[PDB]
Amino acid sequence: SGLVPRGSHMTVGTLVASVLPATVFEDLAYAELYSDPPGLTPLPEEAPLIARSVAKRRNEFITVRHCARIALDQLGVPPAPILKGDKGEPCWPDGMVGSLTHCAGYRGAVVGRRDAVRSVGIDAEPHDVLPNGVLDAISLPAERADMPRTMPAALHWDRILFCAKEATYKAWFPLTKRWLGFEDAHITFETDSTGWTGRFVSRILIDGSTLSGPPLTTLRGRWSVERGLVLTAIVL
């Protein structure tokens, strides 16, 4: 992989840039925000999805899809509604792939052309310890034992693992249309010398057959902790 030198090519301040390897920038567009700008609206075709949701859930939905449309604009794609498929996945315009994520203080979208990008998965979470009991439910025993060997003790690697499980599913589902449980992938980590970024690889433990290509046995990705946020990204 290899990220770009930090801040170079006008990436200073861009959190998602620290999980995108240098070789994927030519294929991917991205947009991120740290708040819900006032005045944003859903497209009419998107509005029914949130008709009965509280304002905070509307704001997440509206903002992150505003991001998705900024990214799509950078690739020459006209505004389109981003609906949801039958297991919650974003429905992208013709010929496009992408991933959406949002959490406290972050909204982000990464998009690409199916011609050049097989699949994308991103996830963001606040950089805080997991609530009690959650780690056991989202991890495998061999996973938990190995994280203290590969990850900084100063970081909430339980939250980072969780985030990587989420990014793994988001990259996996558009290619398989099958559910990947938390126990269905074993993720191993690597930490960069600088201590706040690194790599991961998700080893698939179940049938990895895809509708249109070679089976998925492993999915490589990147992780970063910056400005109180954890980010993970997978680009296949």
Ligand SMILES: [Mg+2]
């Ligand atoms: Mg998430």
Ligand SMILES: [Mg+2]
């Ligand atoms: Mg350790």
Ligand SMILES: [Mg+2]
């Ligand atoms: Mg990749």
